[PDB]
Design a binder for these strands. Structure first.
Ligand SMILES: Nc1ncnc2c1ncn2[C@@H]1O[C@H](COP(=O)(O)OP(=O)(O)OP(=O)(O)O)[C@@H](O)[C@H]1O
Ligand SMILES: [Mg+2]
Ligand SMILES: [Mg+2]
Ligand SMILES: [Zn+2]
Lengths: 205, 1735
RNA sequence: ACGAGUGUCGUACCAAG
RNA sequence: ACUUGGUAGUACACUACU
């Protein structure tokens, strides 16, 4: 327990509490979500993502390897093995960011133009302002952090802290139920949980 | 002080001695007289006897092991051909034993009901429905047997246009509450009750309707039955294997599905939805959709209508004259019932007779489950009438409670299965939930074992089907289910091959991923579709728990059980001649093998503890008084032998049996036998009665039989004083197809068996805190551990034996030789034998236990002689036939053809049968378990010898419960194929069981590859598994009807137990909703009913009322599972805390938020909040209002309930008690009860204890007889009678509510009703004052005092939900470091005993921890001002009255002790094993896993916390000396250094570490403080890199580090990736004085080693090698690859020493070659080189 | 009729005419 | 066999293993 360690947009103190990112396997870190990485971002005005990663280690890590076992109930064991020179924690974090930011931006396109498109920006403003008013529920902060991360990667970290709340609570329901849902991404369940909780809470309110 | 000389002359001992060889007799007699306290060594006798029998044991082991080459691999496989042959044999046997009927009209009703959809057009008015029914009955068109009677019935219920007059007459009758009032051709007696009008019905038609149709009086009374009237025939059942019968059953099922799958045309709106729909939908939307679809179907309406109609039929079955009938209606305006006159339903074994009538617009639109009598045309459609149905109270209760069972079954079978159709599941579930007959039990009970054994690798299921399986198919659904079971058994084996193992992710410390793959390839059993393996096992095991308990009739079940016992006894008498055998004869024991195994096991067990006798004495209170042992002072039943003519005797009649009729009694009337005629008709009848254990102890103490001596001395004296043992039996009443006999014995037998059982228990490896009848879920973890170990053994071994093969094959992969090598590699094999023993207690060789007493080294010769004398007498016990069975057999009038009961009782000359070899059920659990473990040890030895014959590797594990056995075998060999090994293993398992007198059950024993099945618990290849549904279903069918809160609490506990076994959250919410709904139905508490509390308390809805006051449970599913029944108060307090905490403290720990409570104001509090806070302050933390009168109550007799309905106080049960007469004598005395009260007041500890000596125990028993609830615990509470109590008498006062601290009659009668109780409770609570200080006390002693509640509150407050994950590695976990979360160490009873006696060192507690427990209790008492308030109240009352009131002071003391007991009990939270998605290493890990596992059914999430949930407190900061802080610092730095080395860049590691040291904190202790502690300690040599990087290293540290070379200093310059699989770079360095070695290698090739010395000579080289490699380095050196050698070099070599121990040396090439080559010339232990050494 | 059953039972009981 | 009147609270029930 202690004050956060600010090395770029990363928070090493909050890395200490991220138990699923403390794997010593290159494949496990590489194949994580943006939710696991969202807890590490406290940029507070950072326009890039590849500065704090210089504080992450560059030593080789382990990677998984499989092998069949000669037994009557056949099965395959998967163990850890010393990786190559390019299997480092920093490289795994970079690959995680590169894949997951793209996946999320595709999941929150909301447009025929793209993620940065002004209509998508207004939709994201409405989504963030919903949580600005409605008390933070258990499935909101994760999305807020992911949106902030993807805005940093898209070069408009400026247009996240400049969010101005535009309230008629009946309008929210329509805008949200018509909001489309993903199928392939880990947000195939997350964003639907968010919509269900938000519509239920605004109905109660 | 003296032994028993009588034992040597006993007939049983002489028989036992003459059956043994002469040397064995000498050994037994020398072992009995052996004194381990006077011999040179304690094990002189055991070692001598072990050596004497060693040769025979070795010969037996070797001969059994050599059979592995004689196996053929042809074991019992449950393929389709064998199942078909077994089925054919079964059909022949059942056709022989039953009368098979191929005709359809012999079918019994599958469901005792017919149903039709409601008419939306017609009105739902009772009078209009009655008029419509009357018009429809009269207009029946056609002619039949009862058409005229039905039309006459319709006529005699008409009212014409006098509906208004009928309504006013009914209202007038019901207002004041007989003479029938002529309305219009109707003799109305009451609302819908009519009198049979003789003018409207013909006499012949009336007789036909009431005798032939309803069975009312058609029979002849028992006094008039003659020889030609008794029925002799076999039970008639339908031909289940007939083609036409099966087609008819299929037609019935198809029609039921066609009619019942329609929509109701309504909107689903009920209690379950309106109360728990949000939670169910949040947990899983598909479950909400499924239940919403269920509510829309005709199935739900049909079953709800049947339940409601049954309730309305029962409610009017009280006052029925012989010439009347009643009409019952329900919410369906087309379904009615005619209730026919019978006995009062609330009388003994009374039945109800009804006939269902349905009006339907179109024919064939009738639900007819084999119950219809006829469909006749009438005006405007058709009218269907069913046959008359007679039912008893238990079957009516099952019908009433059916809807919850149906909903639970439908939702359990459909959970997460899109391939299943809801209609088929609903059809099957409605037919299995409304079944109240033994026809489907006879299929559900054996289907489990049949299908599980057919799915197994090897099982004996063919002979089970051919010999034991016997379907009992009286209904068409029975035929359908028999066909389903047959198809499942046919398909089980050929679909076994569709199960696949999950990929195993192991990491040298844990297995992250394991289990069975979840692919829907298996074929569903009960309905079309596909299921996974887990869903297959659920379908197999689930219908066994639908069955109703207690469907057996005493008349037949008593005779059945007596026949079973007597048949076993007669078979043993006339066919078991030899006691000892050597060819595995049934019911014989191999003498020498048994003796040797017992000697070896006793030597192993007694060597592990040097104070075993003291453990036995202390753990079982052997030196304490008899009154301090719970089992000797309980309310259980025991037997008394004597002369009880007066007690049991409760015009003359003669017996029906001609063999017991005197010539002067012929001119009399025949009557049912009772005690008087039984006593007169039996010459050698021994009299007996059943009393209570505590009352028997009271009587024995009063008559000076028992004294105040230590209990063990009294037991030893009783073992020789009590020579004749008598037992009786009764039917258990379990849900199986056949009942279990339970034996009740005397008190003295209880003492004698207690001593032996406790002696044998301390050697067993079972948990002393659990019971045999209730195995704990901790075994669920044990299984897992074993499996994991075996998995590792399978991975390391095969790999180790196939490394060379794989390497060569791979080099050749980039061919005939390839397959030649591949067939020469060692293969692995996994086997799981899941076995049960057949007739564990009945067909057992008791004589073997004799040796277990003779060979015991912890007993004296006198004690051994007395125990063996007791066992000899026990082998002479006599079983008393119950008087009811004798009544049954004395009124037959026809001699049974082959009567075993008459033969074994000398034509009923006596009522006792001598039972010799059958030690009765449950009397010798631990002794038998110990001998079973010895048998398994012998079997393991046989397997080890057999496998080492093949030069393979083996690992055998064996878990042994009472008789349940689970043996897991892992084998790795390259010799023979696996089927031969499996066949050998099973043959040797059977032979090992037969050697020790046991026998494997052909019904439950089977063999699998990847399925462990211990007691109701599964291990699916490393993954724990439990059928959680059996906890949900049992929560619906089982209800004691004690009260609303009691039933609700029991059901919530069942739901919590189901959650702990892996129940998905949506199903748990469904179970909780169903529990609440059923509890509200039973006690009329639904919105708008009589007892609805919503409008009596300041609550908007039921969520705002505590569940103790008939509210609903508002708590997260995480709190219920981890706390349970205290989650409502905790959640309410947390909601308050969140509501009234400033926003600057909203996201802090619960402690910091509670610290701000003092700034609250009571004025700005909602009335509901004040109400609930007052309840918490004065009803939970105090005893302001008594739920019942407390005089005579003890400290543990106050629950968490507030409104407790009264129950039965059976006077018949009480008058049998010897101490009750003494209590009644004392009560009717001038100054007896007041003197007793004064004595209790002078010695208040008797309120907590119950007397630790004779006089105090008797006084306490007499005092407790005043409790009025202790008397209700000694009485009979029939669940059926209590069920009809809530229907017949709903407005009767039942609650003994008595305000605030004293401010002809029905058997159950209270003082106020429920609504009056609510009103009085509100009137009294408003008189109390709540202050900010009171709220502080509430928060301080409900949350702040218990670390567990603080943790739970913090988890609810600080939780942050994270990434979704998939369940792949479910594992068992307790709460890590839970002992830090225990505020009070000891049990509440011990803590209260210590508090009352004011003594930290009591006869059962540790004086060190009891002091802390006492100081906790004293702090609670002082801070809540409990004692001060009690003293103030006592003084005020005494001043007001003038003289001291003993009654008031005694009541105040009782309240004080009950409050203290409840507070101490509220601390203990029995968090047992949980099943969690991942492995738990800390408390935070456990809480996060448990919280994230209980929010969605599809996936589990990751939960993080803003702050520390486990904040340091009174149990966390305290209890930690200097070494604890030392370990904390060590853990902190071990963690931080490696975290920096793993996740921090090299150039920023030192700065990061400096920041960690100077600024952060670990476990609430500053890191700087920890670093200072480790620098100022003797362990700084373990943190040299840390000291060097910071700069605090000294030359003294280096001298200390390199000065430990004296003990060969071993260091690992690098960690291996996996040290068990041998992966990762091996870089090892060993150093001593003037010698060092360094070894480098990767995986299994040690690349090289360097040996630095000071004298380069071969002698120094070898001595240094031995001294270095012999250290504790951890490198194996035998798992490394063998290398070639070159001359002049030195090599690290390994060699075998103890078949598992190895020697590592350094040798030369010529040395190795010479020694190996001379070793070849004559197992084969050769020096194997591994690595090269550079000297 | 219904419940139970290869064990004779339940299928209310009593009195009076 | 039939009519009238009267009576009826439980399976009087329950083991070992904590
Ligand atoms: N309800 C019980 N009451 C008393 N002892 C019991 C009870 N259930 C089990 N036992 C004890 O556990 C042992 C195991 O009984 P189990 O139910 O496994 O059947 P069994 O008597 O061995 O016969 P089988 O397997 O052939 O039906 C019994 O012999 C008895 O000692
Ligand atoms: Mg058994
Ligand atoms: Mg068993
Ligand atoms: Zn930012």
């Amino acid at each position: 327990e202690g004050p956060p360690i600010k090395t770029g947009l990363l928070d090493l103190t909050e890395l200490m509490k991220s138990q699923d990112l403390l794997n010593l396997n290159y494949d496990n870190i590489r194949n994580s979500n943006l939710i696991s990485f969202s807890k590490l971002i406290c940029c507070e005005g950072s326009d890039n993502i590849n500065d704090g990663l210089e504080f992450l280690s560059d030593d080789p890590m382990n990677f998984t390897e499989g092998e069949a076992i000669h037994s009557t109930p056949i099965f395959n064991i998967y163990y850890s093995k010393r990786g190559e020179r390019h299997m480092t924690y920093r490289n795994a974090i970079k690959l995680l960011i590169e894949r997951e930011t793209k996946i999320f931006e595709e999941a929150f396109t909301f447009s025929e133009n793209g993620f940065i498109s002004p209509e998508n920006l207004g939709c994201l403003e409405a989504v963030v302002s919903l949580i600005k008013l409605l008390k933070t529920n258990e499935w909101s902060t994760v999305i807020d952090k992911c949106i902030h991360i993807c805005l940093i990667k898209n070069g408009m970290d400026h247009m996240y802290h400049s969010f101005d709340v535009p309230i008629n609570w009946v309008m929210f329901r329509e805008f949200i139920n018509s909001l489309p849902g993903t199928d392939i991404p880990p947000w195939n369940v997350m964003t639907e949980n968010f919509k269900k909780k938000c519509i239920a809470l605004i109905n109660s309110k | 002080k003296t032994g028993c000389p009588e034992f040597w002359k006993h007939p049983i001992y002489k028989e036992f001695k003459m059956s043994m060889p002469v040397p064995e007799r000498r050994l037994f007699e020398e072992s009995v007289k052996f004194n381990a306290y006077e011999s040179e060594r304690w094990n002189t006798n055991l070692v001598k006897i072990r050596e004497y029998t060693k040769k025979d044991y070795s010969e037996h082991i070797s001969k059994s092991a050599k059979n592995i080459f004689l196996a053929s691999g042809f074991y019992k496989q449950p393929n389709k051909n064998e199942i078909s042959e077994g089925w054919t044999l079964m059909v022949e046997r059942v056709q022989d034993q039953r009368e098979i009927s191929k005709s359809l009209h012999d079918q019994k009703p599958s469901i005792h009901f017919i149903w039709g959809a409601h008419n939306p057009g017609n009105s739902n008015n009772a009078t209009f429905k009655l008029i419509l029914l009357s018009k429809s009955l009269q207009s029946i068109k056609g002619i039949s047997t009862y058409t005229e009677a039905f039309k006459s019935l319709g006529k005699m219920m008409d009212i014409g246009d006098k509906a208004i007059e009928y309504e006013e007459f009914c209202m007038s009758l019901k207002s004041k509450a007989l003479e029938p009032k002529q309305i219009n051709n109707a003799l109305v007696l009451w609302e819908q009750q009519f009198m049979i009008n003789n003018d409207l019905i013909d006499k012949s038609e009336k007789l036909k309707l009431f005798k032939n149709f309803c069975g009312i009086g058609k029979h002849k009374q028992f006094k008039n039955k003659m020889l030609e009237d008794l029925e002799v025939s076999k039970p008639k059942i339908l031909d289940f294997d007939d083609a036409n019968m099966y087609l008819a059953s299929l037609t019935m099922m198809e029609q039921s599905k066609k009619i019942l799958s329609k929509s109701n045309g309504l909107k689903p709106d009920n209690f379950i939805l309106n109360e728990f729909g949000s939670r169910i939908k949040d947990a899983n939307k598909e479950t909400y959709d499924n239940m919403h679809k269920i509510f829309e179907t005709g199935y739900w309406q049909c079953i709800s209508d049947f339940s409601t109609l049954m309730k309305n039929i029962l409610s009017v079955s009280q006052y029925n004259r012989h010439n009347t009938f009643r009409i019952a209606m329900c919410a369906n305006n087309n379904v009615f019932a005619i209730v026919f006159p019978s006995a009062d339903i609330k009388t003994k074994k009374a039945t109800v007779v009804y006939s269902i009538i349905v009006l339907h617009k179109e024919e064939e639109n009738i639900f007819n489950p084999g119950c219809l009598h006829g469909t006749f045309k009438c005006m405007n459609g058709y009218i269907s009438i069913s046959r008359a149905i007679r039912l008893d109270k238990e079957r009516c209760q099952r019908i009433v409670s059916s809807p919850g069972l149906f909903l639970t079954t439908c939702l359990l079978f459909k959970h997460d299965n899109p391939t299943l159709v809801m209609s088929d599941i609903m059809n099957f579930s409605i037919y299995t939930s409304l079944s109240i007959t033994k026809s489907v039990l006879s299929l559900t009970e054996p289907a489990r074992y049949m299908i599980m054994n057919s799915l197994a690798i090897s099982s004996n299921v063919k002979d089970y089907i051919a010999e034991k399986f016997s379907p009992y198919t009286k209904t068409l659904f029975s035929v359908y289910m028999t066909r389903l079971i047959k198809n499942a058994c046919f398909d089980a084996y050929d679909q076994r091959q569709r199960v696949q193992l999950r990929d195993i992710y192991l990491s040298d410390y844990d297995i992250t991923q394991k289990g069975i793959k979840d692919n829907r390839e298996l074929t569903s059993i009960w309905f079309p579709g596909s299921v996974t393996l887990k869903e297959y096992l659920t379908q197999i095991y689930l219908p066994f728990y639908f069955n109703a308990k207690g469907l057996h009739e005493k008349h037949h079940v008593m005779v059945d059980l007596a026949k079973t016992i007597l048949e076993i006894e007669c078979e043993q008498r006339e066919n078991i001649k030899e006691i000892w055998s050597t060819n595995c004869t049934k019911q014989t024991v191999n003498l020498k093998i048994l003796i040797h195994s017992l000697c070896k096991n006793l030597l192993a067990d007694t060597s592990r503890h040097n104070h075993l006798r003291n453990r036995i004495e202390n753990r079982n209170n052997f030196r304490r008084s008899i009154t301090t042992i719970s089992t000797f002072t309980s309310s259980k039943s025991c037997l008394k032998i004597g002369d009880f003519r007066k007690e049991k005797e409760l015009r003359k009649m003669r017996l029906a049996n001609p063999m017991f009729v005197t010539d002067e009694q012929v001119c009399l009337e025949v009557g049912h036998c009772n005690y008087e005629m039984l006593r007169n008709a039996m010459p050698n009848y021994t009299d007996y009665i059943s009393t209570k254990v505590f009352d028997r102890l009271y009587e024995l103490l009063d008559k000076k039989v028992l004294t105040d001596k230590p209990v063990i001395e009294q037991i030893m004296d009783m073992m020789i004083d009590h020579k004749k043992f008598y037992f009786t039996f009764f039917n258990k009443g379990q849900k199986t197809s056949k009942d279990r006999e339970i034996f009740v014995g005397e008190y003295e037998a209880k003492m004698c068996m207690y001593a032996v059982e406790r002696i044998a228990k301390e050697r067993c490896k079972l948990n002393p805190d659990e019971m045999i009848s209730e195995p704990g879920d901790g075994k669920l973890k044990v299984l897992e551990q074993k499996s994991e170990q075996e998995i590792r053994f399978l991975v390391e071994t095969t790999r180790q034996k196939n490394r060379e093969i794989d390497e060569a094959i791979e080099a050749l992969a980039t061919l005939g030789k390839i397959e030649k090598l591949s067939l020469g590699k060692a293969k692995g094999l996994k086997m799981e034998i899941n076995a049960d023993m057949s007739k564990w207690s009945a067909q057992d060789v008791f004589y073997k236990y004799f040796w277990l007493i003779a060979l015991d080294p912890i007993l004296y010769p006198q004690e051994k002689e007395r125990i063996l004398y007791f066992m000899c007498n026990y082998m002479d016990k006599e079983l008393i036939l119950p008087d009811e069975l004798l009544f049954n057999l004395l009124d037959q009038k026809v001699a049974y053809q082959n009567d075993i009961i008459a033969t074994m009782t000398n034509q009923l000359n006596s009522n006792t049968v001598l039972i010799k070899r059958n030690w009765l059920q449950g009397n010798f659990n631990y002794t038998s378990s110990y001998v079973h473990s010895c048998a398994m040890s012998v079997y393991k030895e046989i397997l080890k010898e057999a496998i080492t014959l093949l030069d393979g590797s083996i690992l055998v594990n064996s878990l042994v419960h009472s008789d349940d056995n689970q043996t897991s075998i892992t084998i790795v060999q390259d010799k023979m194929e696996n089927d031969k090994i499996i066949d050998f293993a099973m043959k040797e398992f059977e032979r090992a069981c037969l050697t020790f007198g046991c026998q494997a059950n052909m019904k439950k024993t089977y063999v699998t590859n990847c399925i462990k099945e211990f007691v109701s618990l599964f291990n699916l290849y490393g993954e724990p598994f439990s059928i959680y549904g059996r906890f949900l279903l049992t929560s619906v069918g089982d209800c004691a009807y004690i009260g609303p809160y009691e039933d609700l609490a029991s059901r919530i506990s069942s739901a919590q137990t189901a959650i702990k076994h892996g129940c998905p959250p949506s199903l748990a919410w469904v179970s909780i909703a169903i529990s609440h709904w059923m509890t509200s139905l039973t006690y009329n508490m639904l919105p708008g009913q009589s007892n609805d509390p919503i409008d009596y308390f300041p609550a908007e809805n039921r969520k705002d009322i505590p569940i103790e006051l008939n509210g609903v449970l508002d708590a997260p599913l995480s709190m219920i599972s981890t706390v349970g029944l205290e989650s409502g108060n905790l959640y309410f307090l947390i909601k308050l805390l969140s509501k009234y905490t400033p926003v600057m403290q909203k996201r802090e720990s619960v402690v910091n938020q509670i610290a701000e409570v003092k700034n609250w104001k009571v004025e700005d509090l909602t009335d509901n909040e004040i109400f609930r806070l007052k309840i918490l302050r004065y009803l939970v933390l105090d005893a302001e209002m008594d739920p019942s009168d407390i005089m005579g109550e003890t400290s543990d007799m106050r629950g968490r309930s507030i409104l407790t309905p009264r129950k039965f106080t059976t006077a018949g049960s009480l008058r049998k008690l010897y101490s009750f007469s003494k209590y009644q004598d004392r009560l009717s005395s001038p100054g007896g009860m007041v003197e007793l009260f004064t004595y209790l007041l002078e010695k208040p500890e008797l309120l907590v204890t119950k007397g630790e000596d004779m006089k105090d125990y008797m006084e306490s028993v007499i005092f407790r007889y005043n409790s009025k609830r202790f008397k209700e615990s000694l009485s009979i509470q029939n669940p059926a009678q209590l069920f009809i109590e809530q229907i017949l008498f709903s407005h009767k006062p039942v609650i003994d509510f008595s305000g605030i601290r004293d401010k002809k009659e029905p058997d159950i009668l209270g003082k106020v009703t429920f609504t009056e109780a609510y009103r009085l409770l509100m009137r009294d609570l408003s008189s109390l004052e709540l202050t900010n200080d009171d709220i502080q006390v509430i928060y301080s002693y409900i949350i702040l005092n218990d670390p567990m509640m603080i943790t739970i509150a913090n988890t609810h407050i600080l939780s942050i939900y994270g990434s979704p994950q998939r369940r792949m590695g479910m594992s068992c976990s307790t709460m890590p470091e839970f002992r830090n979360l225990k505020l009070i160490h000891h049990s509440p009873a011990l803590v209260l005993r210590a508090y009352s006696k004011n003594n930290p060192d009591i006869q059962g507690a540790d004086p060190t921890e009891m002091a802390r427990d006492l100081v906790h209790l004293k702090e609670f008492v002082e801070n809540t001002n409990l004692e001060e308030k009690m003293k103030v109240r006592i003084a005020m009352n005494e001043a007001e009255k003038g003289q001291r009131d003993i009654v008031f002071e005694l009541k105040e003391m009782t309240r004080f002790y009950q409050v203290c007991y409840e507070y101490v009990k509220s601390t203990e939270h029995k968090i047992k094993v949980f099943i969690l998605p991942a492995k738990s290493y800390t408390t935070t890990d456990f809480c996060s896993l448990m919280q994230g596992n209980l929010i969605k059914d599809k996936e589990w999430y990751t939960v993080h916390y803003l702050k520390q949930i486990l904040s340091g407190g009174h149990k966390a900061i305290m209890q930690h000396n200097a070494t604890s802080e030392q370990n904390i610092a060590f853990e902190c730095f071990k963690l931080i250094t490696h975290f920096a080395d793993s996740f921090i860049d090299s150039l920023s590691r030192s700065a990061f570490l400096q920041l960690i040291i100077d600024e952060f904190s670990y476990k609430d202790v500053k890191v700087s403080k920890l670093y200072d502690i480790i620098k100022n300690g003797y362990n700084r040599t373990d943190f040299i890199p840390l000291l060097f990087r910071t700069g605090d290293l000294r030359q003294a540290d280096l001298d200390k580090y390199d000065a430990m070379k004296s003990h060969e200093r071993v260091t690992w310059n690098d960690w291996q990736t996996s040290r068990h699989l041998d992966m990762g770079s091996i870089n090892l360095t060993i150093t001593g004085y003037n010698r060092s070695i360094t070894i480098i290698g990767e995986d299994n090739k040690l690349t090289y080693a360097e040996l630095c010395l000071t004298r380069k000579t071969p002698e120094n080289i070898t001595i240094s090698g031995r001294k270095l490699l012999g250290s504790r380095h951890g490198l194996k050196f035998e798992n490394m690859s063998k290398i070639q050698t070159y001359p002049g070099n030195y090599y690290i070599t390994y060699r075998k020493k103890d078949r598992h121990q190895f020697v590592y040396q350094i040798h030369s090439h010529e040395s190795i070659t010479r020694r190996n080559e001379e070793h070849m010339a004559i197992i084969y232990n050769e020096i194997t080189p591994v690595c090269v050494v550079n000297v």
